[PDB]
Amino acid sequence: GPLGSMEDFVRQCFNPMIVELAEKTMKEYGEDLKIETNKFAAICTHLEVCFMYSDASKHRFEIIEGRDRTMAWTVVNSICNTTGAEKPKFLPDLYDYKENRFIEIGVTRREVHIYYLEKANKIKSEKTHIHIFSFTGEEMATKADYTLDEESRARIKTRLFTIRQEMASRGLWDSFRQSER
């Protein structure tokens, strides 16, 4: 039927804090949200997932993603100094105080195993744990260790589904999906 605006969708669907942080991430990349709207949506989604992952167990995780790059590195360095954790080469998304490791969060509509292998190939760090979510409910994680319980992860998955369903309902899903990578 009607074909909506992705910008409208993002602003109606995500929390304003998430939207603004997303805008900042894009601006930090010099990129224009009004042209790269699908990517804007992707950034909001990834942010929301990182935030949900953290809220699934308050104070277990330190959030790295969403901060200014400089500030993010200061947080990472302080964590490494306090815990003795090995400094990663790339900025990760979270730190798990319980399992004593950084976490990289991926969100994709590509096939999750391939996506996982790509992330793990890029990272090169034996320590950073990778957790990949797809919009279809599949997930993939380092050493089949999924960190959180089924309830929490299902909450994340459900949110992803809701996003996909509302996109599809506005006619936005095809473009969004095809726009990855």
Ligand X SMILES: Oc1ccc(/C=N/Nc2ccc(Cl)cc2)c(O)c1O
List active site positions. 65, 93
Which one of residues 93, 95, 125, 131 is an interface residue with ligand X (CB under 6 A)?
93
Rounded Cα distance, 165 and 111, in Å: 19
**CA angle at residue 42 from 16 to 9, to 5 degrees?**
50
String marking each residue 78-97 x if it binds Mn ion according to CB under 5 A: ---------------x----
| C-alpha pair distances (Å), 34 with each of 5, 7, 107, 138 | 10, 7, 22, 31
- Decide: is 128 part of the binding site for ligand X (CB under 6 A): no
Token representation of residue 33:
């949200």
Q: Smallest distance from the beta carbon of 46 to Mn ion, in angstroms?
A: 6
Please, what's the largest Cα pairwise distance for the chain?
Answer: 56
Binding positions for ligand X, rule: CB under 6 A: 36, 38-39, 42, 46, 65, 91, 93, 105-109, 135, 176-177, 179-181
Q: Which residues are annotated as a binding site for Mn(2+)?
A: 46, 65, 93, 104-105
